[PDB]
Design a protein around this ligand. Structure first.
Ligand SMILES: [Mg+2]
Ligand SMILES: [Mg+2]
Ligand SMILES: [Mg+2]
Ligand SMILES: [Mg+2]
Ligand SMILES: [Mg+2]
Ligand SMILES: [Mg+2]
Ligand SMILES: [Mg+2]
Ligand SMILES: [Mg+2]
Ligand SMILES: [Mg+2]
Ligand SMILES: [Mg+2]
Ligand SMILES: [Mg+2]
Ligand SMILES: [Mg+2]
Ligand SMILES: [Mg+2]
Ligand SMILES: [Mg+2]
Ligand SMILES: [Mg+2]
Ligand SMILES: [Mg+2]
Ligand SMILES: [Mg+2]
Ligand SMILES: [Mg+2]
Ligand SMILES: [Mg+2]
Ligand SMILES: [Mg+2]
Ligand SMILES: [Mg+2]
Ligand SMILES: [Mg+2]
Ligand SMILES: [Mg+2]
Ligand SMILES: [Mg+2]
Ligand SMILES: [Mg+2]
Ligand SMILES: [Mg+2]
Ligand SMILES: [Mg+2]
Ligand SMILES: [Mg+2]
Ligand SMILES: [Mg+2]
Ligand SMILES: [Mg+2]
Ligand SMILES: [Mg+2]
Ligand SMILES: [Mg+2]
Ligand SMILES: [Mg+2]
Ligand SMILES: [Mg+2]
Ligand SMILES: [Mg+2]
Ligand SMILES: [Mg+2]
Ligand SMILES: [Mg+2]
Ligand SMILES: [Mg+2]
Ligand SMILES: [Mg+2]
Ligand SMILES: [Mg+2]
Ligand SMILES: [Mg+2]
Ligand SMILES: [Mg+2]
Ligand SMILES: [Mg+2]
Ligand SMILES: [Mg+2]
Ligand SMILES: [Mg+2]
Ligand SMILES: [Mg+2]
Ligand SMILES: [Mg+2]
Ligand SMILES: [Mg+2]
Ligand SMILES: [Mg+2]
Ligand SMILES: [Mg+2]
Ligand SMILES: [Mg+2]
Ligand SMILES: [Mg+2]
Ligand SMILES: [Mg+2]
Ligand SMILES: [Mg+2]
Ligand SMILES: [Mg+2]
Ligand SMILES: [Mg+2]
Ligand SMILES: [Mg+2]
Ligand SMILES: [Mg+2]
Ligand SMILES: [Mg+2]
Ligand SMILES: [Mg+2]
Ligand SMILES: [Mg+2]
Ligand SMILES: [Mg+2]
Ligand SMILES: [Mg+2]
Ligand SMILES: [Mg+2]
Ligand SMILES: [Mg+2]
Ligand SMILES: [Mg+2]
Ligand SMILES: [Mg+2]
Ligand SMILES: [Mg+2]
Ligand SMILES: [Mg+2]
Ligand SMILES: [Mg+2]
Ligand SMILES: [Mg+2]
Ligand SMILES: [Mg+2]
Ligand SMILES: [Mg+2]
Ligand SMILES: [Mg+2]
Ligand SMILES: [Mg+2]
Ligand SMILES: [Mg+2]
Ligand SMILES: [Mg+2]
Ligand SMILES: [Mg+2]
Ligand SMILES: [Mg+2]
Ligand SMILES: [Mg+2]
Ligand SMILES: [Mg+2]
Ligand SMILES: [Mg+2]
Ligand SMILES: [Mg+2]
Ligand SMILES: [Mg+2]
Ligand SMILES: [Mg+2]
Ligand SMILES: [Mg+2]
Ligand SMILES: [Mg+2]
Ligand SMILES: [Mg+2]
Ligand SMILES: [Mg+2]
Ligand SMILES: [Mg+2]
Ligand SMILES: [Mg+2]
Ligand SMILES: [Mg+2]
Ligand SMILES: [Mg+2]
Ligand SMILES: [Mg+2]
Ligand SMILES: [Mg+2]
Ligand SMILES: [Mg+2]
Ligand SMILES: [Mg+2]
Ligand SMILES: [Mg+2]
Ligand SMILES: [Mg+2]
Ligand SMILES: [Mg+2]
Ligand SMILES: [Mg+2]
Ligand SMILES: [Mg+2]
Ligand SMILES: [Mg+2]
Ligand SMILES: [Mg+2]
Ligand SMILES: [Mg+2]
Ligand SMILES: [Mg+2]
Ligand SMILES: [Mg+2]
Ligand SMILES: [Mg+2]
Ligand SMILES: [Mg+2]
Ligand SMILES: [Mg+2]
Ligand SMILES: [Mg+2]
Ligand SMILES: [Mg+2]
Ligand SMILES: [Mg+2]
Ligand SMILES: [Mg+2]
Ligand SMILES: [Mg+2]
Ligand SMILES: [Mg+2]
Ligand SMILES: [Mg+2]
Ligand SMILES: [Mg+2]
Ligand SMILES: [Mg+2]
Ligand SMILES: [Mg+2]
Ligand SMILES: [Mg+2]
Ligand SMILES: [Mg+2]
Ligand SMILES: [Mg+2]
Ligand SMILES: [Mg+2]
Ligand SMILES: [Mg+2]
Ligand SMILES: [Mg+2]
Ligand SMILES: [Mg+2]
Ligand SMILES: [Mg+2]
Ligand SMILES: [Mg+2]
Ligand SMILES: [Mg+2]
Ligand SMILES: [Mg+2]
Ligand SMILES: [Mg+2]
Ligand SMILES: [Mg+2]
Ligand SMILES: [Mg+2]
Ligand SMILES: [Mg+2]
Ligand SMILES: [Mg+2]
Ligand SMILES: [Mg+2]
Ligand SMILES: [Mg+2]
Ligand SMILES: [Mg+2]
Ligand SMILES: [Mg+2]
Ligand SMILES: [Mg+2]
Ligand SMILES: [Mg+2]
Ligand SMILES: [Mg+2]
Ligand SMILES: [Mg+2]
Ligand SMILES: [Mg+2]
Ligand SMILES: [Mg+2]
Ligand SMILES: [Mg+2]
Ligand SMILES: [Mg+2]
Ligand SMILES: [Mg+2]
Ligand SMILES: [Mg+2]
Ligand SMILES: [Mg+2]
Ligand SMILES: [Mg+2]
Ligand SMILES: [Mg+2]
Ligand SMILES: [Mg+2]
Ligand SMILES: [Mg+2]
Ligand SMILES: [Mg+2]
Ligand SMILES: [Mg+2]
Ligand SMILES: [Mg+2]
Ligand SMILES: [Mg+2]
Ligand SMILES: [Mg+2]
Ligand SMILES: [Mg+2]
Ligand SMILES: [Mg+2]
Ligand SMILES: [Mg+2]
Ligand SMILES: [Mg+2]
Ligand SMILES: [Mg+2]
Ligand SMILES: [Mg+2]
Ligand SMILES: [Mg+2]
Ligand SMILES: [Mg+2]
Ligand SMILES: [Mg+2]
Ligand SMILES: [Mg+2]
Ligand SMILES: [Mg+2]
Ligand SMILES: [Mg+2]
Ligand SMILES: [Mg+2]
Ligand SMILES: [Mg+2]
Ligand SMILES: [Mg+2]
Ligand SMILES: [Mg+2]
Ligand SMILES: [Mg+2]
Ligand SMILES: [Mg+2]
Ligand SMILES: [Mg+2]
Ligand SMILES: [Mg+2]
Ligand SMILES: [Mg+2]
Ligand SMILES: [Mg+2]
Ligand SMILES: [Mg+2]
Ligand SMILES: [Mg+2]
Ligand SMILES: [Mg+2]
Ligand SMILES: [Mg+2]
Ligand SMILES: [Mg+2]
Ligand SMILES: [Mg+2]
Ligand SMILES: [Mg+2]
Ligand SMILES: [Mg+2]
Ligand SMILES: [Mg+2]
Ligand SMILES: [Mg+2]
Ligand SMILES: [Mg+2]
Ligand SMILES: [Mg+2]
Ligand SMILES: [Mg+2]
Ligand SMILES: [Mg+2]
Ligand SMILES: [Mg+2]
Ligand SMILES: [Mg+2]
Ligand SMILES: [Mg+2]
Ligand SMILES: [Mg+2]
Ligand SMILES: [Mg+2]
Ligand SMILES: [Mg+2]
Ligand SMILES: [Mg+2]
Ligand SMILES: [Mg+2]
Ligand SMILES: [Mg+2]
Ligand SMILES: [Mg+2]
Ligand SMILES: [Mg+2]
Ligand SMILES: [Mg+2]
Ligand SMILES: [Mg+2]
Ligand SMILES: [Mg+2]
Ligand SMILES: [Mg+2]
Ligand SMILES: [Mg+2]
Ligand SMILES: [Mg+2]
Ligand SMILES: [Mg+2]
Ligand SMILES: [Mg+2]
Ligand SMILES: [Mg+2]
Ligand SMILES: [Mg+2]
Ligand SMILES: [Mg+2]
Ligand SMILES: [Mg+2]
Ligand SMILES: [Mg+2]
Ligand SMILES: [Mg+2]
Ligand SMILES: [Mg+2]
Ligand SMILES: [Mg+2]
Ligand SMILES: [Mg+2]
Ligand SMILES: [Mg+2]
Ligand SMILES: [Mg+2]
Ligand SMILES: [Mg+2]
Ligand SMILES: [Mg+2]
Ligand SMILES: [Mg+2]
Ligand SMILES: [Mg+2]
Ligand SMILES: [Mg+2]
Ligand SMILES: [Mg+2]
Ligand SMILES: [Mg+2]
Ligand SMILES: [Mg+2]
Ligand SMILES: [Mg+2]
Ligand SMILES: [Mg+2]
Ligand SMILES: [Mg+2]
Ligand SMILES: [Mg+2]
Ligand SMILES: [Mg+2]
Ligand SMILES: [Mg+2]
Ligand SMILES: [Mg+2]
Ligand SMILES: [Mg+2]
Ligand SMILES: [Mg+2]
Ligand SMILES: [Mg+2]
Ligand SMILES: [Mg+2]
Ligand SMILES: [Mg+2]
Ligand SMILES: [Mg+2]
Ligand SMILES: [Mg+2]
Ligand SMILES: [Mg+2]
Ligand SMILES: [Mg+2]
Ligand SMILES: [Mg+2]
Ligand SMILES: [Mg+2]
Ligand SMILES: [Mg+2]
Ligand SMILES: [Mg+2]
Ligand SMILES: [Mg+2]
Ligand SMILES: [Mg+2]
Ligand SMILES: [Mg+2]
Ligand SMILES: [Mg+2]
Ligand SMILES: [Mg+2]
Ligand SMILES: [Mg+2]
Ligand SMILES: [Mg+2]
Ligand SMILES: [Mg+2]
Ligand SMILES: [Mg+2]
Ligand SMILES: [Mg+2]
Ligand SMILES: [Mg+2]
Ligand SMILES: [Mg+2]
Ligand SMILES: [Mg+2]
Ligand SMILES: [Mg+2]
Ligand SMILES: [Mg+2]
Ligand SMILES: [Mg+2]
Ligand SMILES: [Mg+2]
Ligand SMILES: [Mg+2]
Lengths: 124, 97
RNA sequence: CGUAACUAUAACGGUCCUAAGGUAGCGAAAUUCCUUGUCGGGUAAGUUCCGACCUGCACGAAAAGCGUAACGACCGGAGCG
RNA sequence: CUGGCCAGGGUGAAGCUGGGGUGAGACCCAGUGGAGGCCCGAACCGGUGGGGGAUGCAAACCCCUCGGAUGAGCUGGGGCU
RNA sequence: GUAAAAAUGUUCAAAA
RNA sequence: CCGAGGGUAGGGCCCGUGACUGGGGCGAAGUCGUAACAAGGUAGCUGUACCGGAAGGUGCGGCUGGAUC
RNA sequence: UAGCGCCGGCCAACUCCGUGCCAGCAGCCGCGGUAAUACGGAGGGCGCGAGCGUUACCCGGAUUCACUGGGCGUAAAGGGCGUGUAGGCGGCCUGGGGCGUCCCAUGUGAAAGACCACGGCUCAACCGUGGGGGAGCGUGGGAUACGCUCAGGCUAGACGGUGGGAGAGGGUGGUGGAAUUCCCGGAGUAGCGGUGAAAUGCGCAGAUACCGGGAGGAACGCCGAUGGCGAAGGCAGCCACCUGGUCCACCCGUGACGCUGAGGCGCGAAAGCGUGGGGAGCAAACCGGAUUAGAUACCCGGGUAGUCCACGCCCUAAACGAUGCGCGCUAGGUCUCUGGGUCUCCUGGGGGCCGAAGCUAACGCGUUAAGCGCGCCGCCUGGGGAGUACGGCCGCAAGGCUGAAACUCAAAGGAAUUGACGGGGGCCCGCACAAGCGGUGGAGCAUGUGGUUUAAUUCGAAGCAACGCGAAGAACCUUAC
RNA sequence: AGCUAGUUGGUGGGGUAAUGGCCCACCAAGGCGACGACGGGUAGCCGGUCUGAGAGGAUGGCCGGCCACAGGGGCACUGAGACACGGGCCCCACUCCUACGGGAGGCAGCAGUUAGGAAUCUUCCGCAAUGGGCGCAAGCCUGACGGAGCGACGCCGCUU
């Protein structure tokens, strides 16, 4: 690409598509469950993952994943959306901030609690 | 009658004791790969127990091979115990058992 | 006549007959009986009209087939003044 | 066969002339030009819609309206089937 | 420059 | 005179939405056939043209990224 | 007061239980269907600590937009080919200017910030003070090798004069014979044709085969080629005319006039389109015959556009050497076409193979580069979606050019090993076939297996390589039912 | 991918503190554009900040400088200076008052409220300091400013 060609053309500044339009470029978005059910995973695996269709305050309506063991999410559960896909669940590219608004923390969780919203199990 | 799906593209193995199609249902291994199934279906040699059932997930149905030759013998509803097919001349399961 | 992951339907198949069994394109039409077919549009409300879907009673290639700018004291449906 | 008639407007084809362009061209611009079953509209030729007339003015008329109006135009006289 | 004719089905890990 | 703005009319760009329809993607014992990979059983592929349920087939020119004694 | 993240690899840190492709994990590769350092808990361990993790956004790693610092023969990528506009680049020598460019001085570059110091709050964070750098730009002075510019000169680049060379280079006109088909005439008779084998087809209304005569169209056998020519597409009997490019010799002329080239303009195989003409052979479509499960194909018999010519469109291609053009430099060996000459060879242009150094991922390239360098254009930036959609332009149309995104994948892919495979090949064996004799399948009975039946008819083996097999001894024993 | 009528320039006027099509008559056809005009999308710019070996890339929160705005829009008055956030006039939208003839209002000042949102604080203390305004001065005013309050939001020091 001769010096001249660069003088006339120039190089192509790369641009990046936000892998997550939670919008407002915010880290979280207050949503409202509309539907909650189990979706079958992709090709190699096989389970019954728990997911929830949510109506965001950003106008959009996306589906999200609910990590943990069982839940208290229903047709109207308000909830906070986190952001981070799930390479195994088609289009599901947002997580539910387990332990906020109407999403209770994982019951009987000891290991990691920063996630799962479950607090210090005072067993003394 | 037919399938009952929601967001899942495959029927889950209904584990037993619900399957009142045949007698004595008796559980079994996970040996014979999936039609690209991520693994190995659920088998229930069962009445006689010289008889085997592996599960059709796409299909909704479990299919019977003989204990001995290992030759497809039918497809039947887990619900009833009424079959759904003919015996397929063209597959053998005993290479997986 | 039969047949595809529920039903549906039938790319597929069997079979009888023919000189050969209707292609493209169009289709409730200046052709559609059932019929004001069924969706959708327009209206407060629309057997008409416009746009779609074909199970076309009974389109179809020079008794031309499907379009087409311009033209029309032609026949239809709309608004504004 | 031989004569006659078609107010006045409008649009502005081809050509030419000049400029541009090219290797030469094609071609592009203005100006001139004045084409056409072109446009508006009297005479003229019609006869669309309505109203009237219905022992009529009239055995096809009248009023308003509308079509054609340099063309496959209208029309007098002389002829033929 | 010349073999008439013969379609199609199965799916994982082990070594240091 | 100008003039915010209001009103009327016709344009230009974009966005959402629509009976229906086109193709694109993914699916855990769907159907049909075998087009390509080995001369894949008619060498393949290519621009184009006509045609057939489907891959495709055939015509003309092309390429070798084709075997073979 | 001590907490949170982590412990499968990148990544520091290992075991038990629970679970059993479920419940779940997850940043990528992936883990989980019974011993799971990957899931849940625990013990233990690692990391960091009033914090630890998570999500979002930016730089990094990403030399993955590459000035520093990349590429294009097959991985993504050379424009189908010329001509040429602006623009980019410019041979050897002397002189002038002094814009670039270099140096010096000075103005400016505020404060804060950032760097080096020294100090002030007990330290630090913060903070004061001083120092020092700062591309840019403005004014003044100086230098001139290089780039530029004005002027003078040269010939090594480019072009031109002269004399000859080869060639299927292109266009127009004309002409020859071979052969095919059709017609006419003669002679003659029972089949011809065609395939793997046939059939449809043609033939006693006299075909095929042969002879003679005529019409018409298309293509040019042997020469002929690892051959030549052209920018590419592409070009082939012979003849003449009009005409392009190119190679050598002579060193005679001009005197840097040169290279490239966005856009523009012209050309551009076959197929296809329009108007008119021509039409022998061939042949999409189409109709038959066979083959086949089918055969909308392969094979056979027919057969129309089209192929052919003129004029006008179309403008694509594996338009391929998949390699842009130009100039210089870096061993030769061999054969071939064409020249010049002091003809076992020297020398110039071109076409091939093997090959120095060297480049390269390898395969291979190598004075015809993919080597070593400079000038200019073109193009690439993950696979699919897609050369699609929309907009624009062009077209009579078919279509052509320009040319996305959403979404989705964890790859797509190049070259080369090792095998395996082949209705690929070469050479070679075996009761594998052929050659030959006796058999099973048939019937009766014995037995082993399947299936079915049953209170149970126990279990296992399952193409070859399970089936008189385990059982080389089942009346209860055996024996597991 | 073509744009342009106050359009580009001229002459003489009006206007300003002043140049100028800034505006007005008259004249002339001009002005710009692939060195990307015209159009659309987006955005306050800078000293600096973040990151990187650097070049470069990203960025403009606090602090300092400059521009712009003060519910949307237009106008001018006074004035050295403004088209003026807490001045004025008009229109529009919203709020409150009314005796329905009409009135008053502008937190993008400090604090607080409300809505929105993943989320952002006290209706605090003082003019003592510094800076500002008027004033002979004393002094008056100062939600600038000087401090305190709340929040692990950051950096830093400290403890179990
Ligand atoms: Mg470069
Ligand atoms: Mg989601
Ligand atoms: Mg629950
Ligand atoms: Mg529940
Ligand atoms: Mg619950
Ligand atoms: Mg619940
Ligand atoms: Mg993430
Ligand atoms: Mg989703
Ligand atoms: Mg499969
Ligand atoms: Mg059903
Ligand atoms: Mg069905
Ligand atoms: Mg049939
Ligand atoms: Mg049938
Ligand atoms: Mg047909
Ligand atoms: Mg047909
Ligand atoms: Mg049809
Ligand atoms: Mg029609
Ligand atoms: Mg209909
Ligand atoms: Mg209807
Ligand atoms: Mg009809
Ligand atoms: Mg009807
Ligand atoms: Mg009716
Ligand atoms: Mg109705
Ligand atoms: Mg209806
Ligand atoms: Mg309706
Ligand atoms: Mg309606
Ligand atoms: Mg309605
Ligand atoms: Mg009406
Ligand atoms: Mg009506
Ligand atoms: Mg209709
Ligand atoms: Mg119907
Ligand atoms: Mg019919
Ligand atoms: Mg009919
Ligand atoms: Mg008809
Ligand atoms: Mg008819
Ligand atoms: Mg017909
Ligand atoms: Mg007819
Ligand atoms: Mg007609
Ligand atoms: Mg029609
Ligand atoms: Mg048309
Ligand atoms: Mg019409
Ligand atoms: Mg008429
Ligand atoms: Mg009419
Ligand atoms: Mg009306
Ligand atoms: Mg004129
Ligand atoms: Mg003209
Ligand atoms: Mg000229
Ligand atoms: Mg003219
Ligand atoms: Mg005229
Ligand atoms: Mg005139
Ligand atoms: Mg006329
Ligand atoms: Mg008229
Ligand atoms: Mg008229
Ligand atoms: Mg008239
Ligand atoms: Mg009159
Ligand atoms: Mg008169
Ligand atoms: Mg008449
Ligand atoms: Mg009259
Ligand atoms: Mg009348
Ligand atoms: Mg009428
Ligand atoms: Mg009338
Ligand atoms: Mg009347
Ligand atoms: Mg009447
Ligand atoms: Mg009457
Ligand atoms: Mg009139
Ligand atoms: Mg008229
Ligand atoms: Mg006329
Ligand atoms: Mg007459
Ligand atoms: Mg007479
Ligand atoms: Mg054959
Ligand atoms: Mg077959
Ligand atoms: Mg198949
Ligand atoms: Mg099959
Ligand atoms: Mg397979
Ligand atoms: Mg070791
Ligand atoms: Mg006015
Ligand atoms: Mg106005
Ligand atoms: Mg207005
Ligand atoms: Mg108003
Ligand atoms: Mg308005
Ligand atoms: Mg307006
Ligand atoms: Mg409007
Ligand atoms: Mg409008
Ligand atoms: Mg749209
Ligand atoms: Mg729309
Ligand atoms: Mg739309
Ligand atoms: Mg729309
Ligand atoms: Mg839809
Ligand atoms: Mg759709
Ligand atoms: Mg689809
Ligand atoms: Mg496609
Ligand atoms: Mg596809
Ligand atoms: Mg599938
Ligand atoms: Mg399958
Ligand atoms: Mg399939
Ligand atoms: Mg094949
Ligand atoms: Mg093929
Ligand atoms: Mg083949
Ligand atoms: Mg293909
Ligand atoms: Mg082809
Ligand atoms: Mg065609
Ligand atoms: Mg065919
Ligand atoms: Mg071919
Ligand atoms: Mg960690
Ligand atoms: Mg480690
Ligand atoms: Mg234990
Ligand atoms: Mg479980
Ligand atoms: Mg974890
Ligand atoms: Mg266990
Ligand atoms: Mg375990
Ligand atoms: Mg495991
Ligand atoms: Mg572990
Ligand atoms: Mg982990
Ligand atoms: Mg664990
Ligand atoms: Mg522990
Ligand atoms: Mg611990
Ligand atoms: Mg990055
Ligand atoms: Mg690193
Ligand atoms: Mg970089
Ligand atoms: Mg470079
Ligand atoms: Mg690269
Ligand atoms: Mg390729
Ligand atoms: Mg390539
Ligand atoms: Mg090339
Ligand atoms: Mg190419
Ligand atoms: Mg070129
Ligand atoms: Mg070019
Ligand atoms: Mg091209
Ligand atoms: Mg050139
Ligand atoms: Mg130049
Ligand atoms: Mg030049
Ligand atoms: Mg000199
Ligand atoms: Mg000089
Ligand atoms: Mg000098
Ligand atoms: Mg200088
Ligand atoms: Mg300085
Ligand atoms: Mg200085
Ligand atoms: Mg400074
Ligand atoms: Mg300073
Ligand atoms: Mg600072
Ligand atoms: Mg110190
Ligand atoms: Mg210090
Ligand atoms: Mg100190
Ligand atoms: Mg100190
Ligand atoms: Mg210090
Ligand atoms: Mg300092
Ligand atoms: Mg000099
Ligand atoms: Mg000179
Ligand atoms: Mg000389
Ligand atoms: Mg020649
Ligand atoms: Mg000729
Ligand atoms: Mg000739
Ligand atoms: Mg002859
Ligand atoms: Mg013929
Ligand atoms: Mg004869
Ligand atoms: Mg016969
Ligand atoms: Mg006879
Ligand atoms: Mg005879
Ligand atoms: Mg002879
Ligand atoms: Mg002859
Ligand atoms: Mg070449
Ligand atoms: Mg060639
Ligand atoms: Mg010549
Ligand atoms: Mg010559
Ligand atoms: Mg010589
Ligand atoms: Mg010379
Ligand atoms: Mg010499
Ligand atoms: Mg000389
Ligand atoms: Mg001389
Ligand atoms: Mg000279
Ligand atoms: Mg000289
Ligand atoms: Mg041309
Ligand atoms: Mg062509
Ligand atoms: Mg052709
Ligand atoms: Mg033609
Ligand atoms: Mg035609
Ligand atoms: Mg023709
Ligand atoms: Mg013929
Ligand atoms: Mg003919
Ligand atoms: Mg033929
Ligand atoms: Mg065959
Ligand atoms: Mg066959
Ligand atoms: Mg077959
Ligand atoms: Mg075949
Ligand atoms: Mg044939
Ligand atoms: Mg044929
Ligand atoms: Mg055709
Ligand atoms: Mg055609
Ligand atoms: Mg033709
Ligand atoms: Mg192309
Ligand atoms: Mg080039
Ligand atoms: Mg010689
Ligand atoms: Mg040579
Ligand atoms: Mg050579
Ligand atoms: Mg070597
Ligand atoms: Mg080497
Ligand atoms: Mg080589
Ligand atoms: Mg050489
Ligand atoms: Mg060479
Ligand atoms: Mg070579
Ligand atoms: Mg391009
Ligand atoms: Mg892509
Ligand atoms: Mg992509
Ligand atoms: Mg294309
Ligand atoms: Mg388009
Ligand atoms: Mg067009
Ligand atoms: Mg056409
Ligand atoms: Mg198109
Ligand atoms: Mg590739
Ligand atoms: Mg690969
Ligand atoms: Mg390869
Ligand atoms: Mg044998
Ligand atoms: Mg034998
Ligand atoms: Mg034998
Ligand atoms: Mg025998
Ligand atoms: Mg026997
Ligand atoms: Mg048995
Ligand atoms: Mg039993
Ligand atoms: Mg037994
Ligand atoms: Mg048993
Ligand atoms: Mg056992
Ligand atoms: Mg047994
Ligand atoms: Mg056992
Ligand atoms: Mg076995
Ligand atoms: Mg034996
Ligand atoms: Mg004016
Ligand atoms: Mg003036
Ligand atoms: Mg003045
Ligand atoms: Mg002023
Ligand atoms: Mg102005
Ligand atoms: Mg002024
Ligand atoms: Mg004026
Ligand atoms: Mg003008
Ligand atoms: Mg410039
Ligand atoms: Mg630009
Ligand atoms: Mg704007
Ligand atoms: Mg903004
Ligand atoms: Mg920098
Ligand atoms: Mg930097
Ligand atoms: Mg900056
Ligand atoms: Mg900026
Ligand atoms: Mg701020
Ligand atoms: Mg600060
Ligand atoms: Mg502030
Ligand atoms: Mg600031
Ligand atoms: Mg305002
Ligand atoms: Mg406000
Ligand atoms: Mg204002
Ligand atoms: Mg004042
Ligand atoms: Mg004052
Ligand atoms: Mg004043
Ligand atoms: Mg004042
Ligand atoms: Mg003033
Ligand atoms: Mg102001
Ligand atoms: Mg004020
Ligand atoms: Mg104001
Ligand atoms: Mg205020
Ligand atoms: Mg009162
Ligand atoms: Mg007041
Ligand atoms: Mg007010
Ligand atoms: Mg406030
Ligand atoms: Mg507040
Ligand atoms: Mg709030
Ligand atoms: Mg809220
Ligand atoms: Mg504060
Ligand atoms: Mg004070
Ligand atoms: Mg004071
Ligand atoms: Mg004072
Ligand atoms: Mg006082
Ligand atoms: Mg303060
Ligand atoms: Mg604290
Ligand atoms: Mg700390």
């Amino acid at each position: 690409p001769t010096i001249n060609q660069l003088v006339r053309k120039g190089r192509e500044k790369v641009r990046k598509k936000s892998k997550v339009p939670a919008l407002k470029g915010a880290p979280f978005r207050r949503g409202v469950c509309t539907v909650v059910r189990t979706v079958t995973p992709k090709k190699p695996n096989s389970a019954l993952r728990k997911v929830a269709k949510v109506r965001l305050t950003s106008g959009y309506e996306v589906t999200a994943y609910i990590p943990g063991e069982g839940h208290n999410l229903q047709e109207h559960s308000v909830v906070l959306i986190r952001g981070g896909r799930v390479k195994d669940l088609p289009g599901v590219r947002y997580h539910i901030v387990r332990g906020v608004y109407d999403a209770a923390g994982v019951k009987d969780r000891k290991k990691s609690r920063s996630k799962y919203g479950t607090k210090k199990p005072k067993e003394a | 009658k037919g399938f009952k799906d929601y967001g899942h593209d495959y029927h889950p193995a209904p584990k037993t004791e619900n399957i009142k199609g045949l007698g004595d249902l008796k559980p079994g291994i996970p040996k014979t790969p999936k039609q690209n199934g991520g693994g190995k279906r659920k088998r229930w040699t069962g009445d006689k127990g010289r008889k085997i059932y592996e599960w059709d997930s796409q299909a909704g149905e479990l299919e019977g091979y003989r204990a001995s030759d290992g030759q497809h013998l039918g497809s039947f509803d887990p619900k009833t115990g009424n079959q759904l097919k003919g015996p397929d001349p063209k597959r053998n399961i005993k290479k997986y058992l």
